[PDB]
Amino acid sequence: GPGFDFAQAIMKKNTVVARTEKGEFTMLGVHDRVAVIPTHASVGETIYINDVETKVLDACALRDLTDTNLEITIVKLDRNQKFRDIRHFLPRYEDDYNDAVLSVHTSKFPNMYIPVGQVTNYGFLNLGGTPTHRILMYNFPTRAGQCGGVVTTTGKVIGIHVGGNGAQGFAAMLLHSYFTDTAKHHHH
Ligand SMILES: *[C@@H](O)[C@H](C[C@@H]1CCNC1=O)NC(=O)[C@H](CC(C)C)NC(=O)OCc1ccccc1
C-alpha cells in the first residue's frame, strides 16, 4: 500500500506550522535551518514557526531559466533547532510516482495523512493566474488549508502542495539539487 510509516517519520521530525500574512502553511524543514514553503505564502522579514516569531534570514523564490515561477520558496530561519538532514530523500530528477501520501501539519490539522494515489509529472500549469512549471498532479480533491502539505512515497520526499481545482491537486517538485552547497553570487 501507501508508505504511511515514511510520511509519519517525515512529519514527526521535519515539519512545522508556519504562519505569514497569508495564513498558515505546512512547512517542510530540509536541513540545518533551511525549510520550504509555497511561494504564495508571501514570506517577509519575520515568520511565525509553531506560533513563535522567527527572523527570516533569507528567502529565495525559485524560478527556472525561462523566468517562470516554480512556486517553491526556500527560507533560512533564525532558530536554535536544526532540522534532520533529509536531502538524501529528495529525488534527483523529475519523475512520476505511485501511490503517494499527502501529509498536512497546521493548527487546524496537526497531523493528517491523505493517500492521493498516482502522481504524474504534469509540467506547465496556470496556477490560479500564475504560470508555473515543474508541477506534479494527483487526482484527488485537495482543499484550502493543505498548502505546503508534504507529498511522499516511501523513501522519497517529492514535493509540497500548492493548489487544486476541485478534482485534482498540484504540488511543486522538490529536487535534490535545490539544496546543495554551490557558488558565491548576489541573489537579491
Ligand atoms: C493553498 O494555499 C491552496 C490550495 C488549493 C486551494 C483549493 N484547493 C487546493 O488544493 N492554494 C491555492 O489556492 C492556489 C494559490 C495560488 C497563488 C498558487 N490557487 C489555486 O489553487 O487555484 C485553483 C486552481 C488550481 C489549478 C488550475 C485552475 C484553478
Residue numbers in the entry: 1 to 188
From the paper:
Rupintrivir, AG7404, GC-376, and PF-00835231 showed inhibition against EV68-3C protease, while there was no observable inhibition with nirmatrelvir or ensitrelvir in this assay. We performed extensive co-crystallization trials with the 3C inhibitors that showed activity against EV68-3C in the enzymatic assays and achieved diffraction-quality crystals with rupintrivir, AG7404, and GC-376. The resulting structures are all the same space group (P3 21 1), had a clearly defined electron density for the entire inhibitor, and diffracted to sub 2 Å, facilitating direct comparison. GC-376, a smaller inhibitor, formed similar hydrogen bonds, with several residues found in all three inhibitors. Across all three structures, interactions between the inhibitor and Thr142, His161, Val162, and Gly164 were conserved. Within the S1 pocket, the g-lactam ring extended beyond the substrate envelope into the solvent. Based on this observation, mutations at Gly166 or Ala144 could introduce a steric bulk, blocking the protruding P1 moieties and decreasing the inhibitor’s ability to bind without impacting substrate binding. From these data, we predict that GC-376 would have a higher barrier to resistance compared to rupintrivir or AG7404.
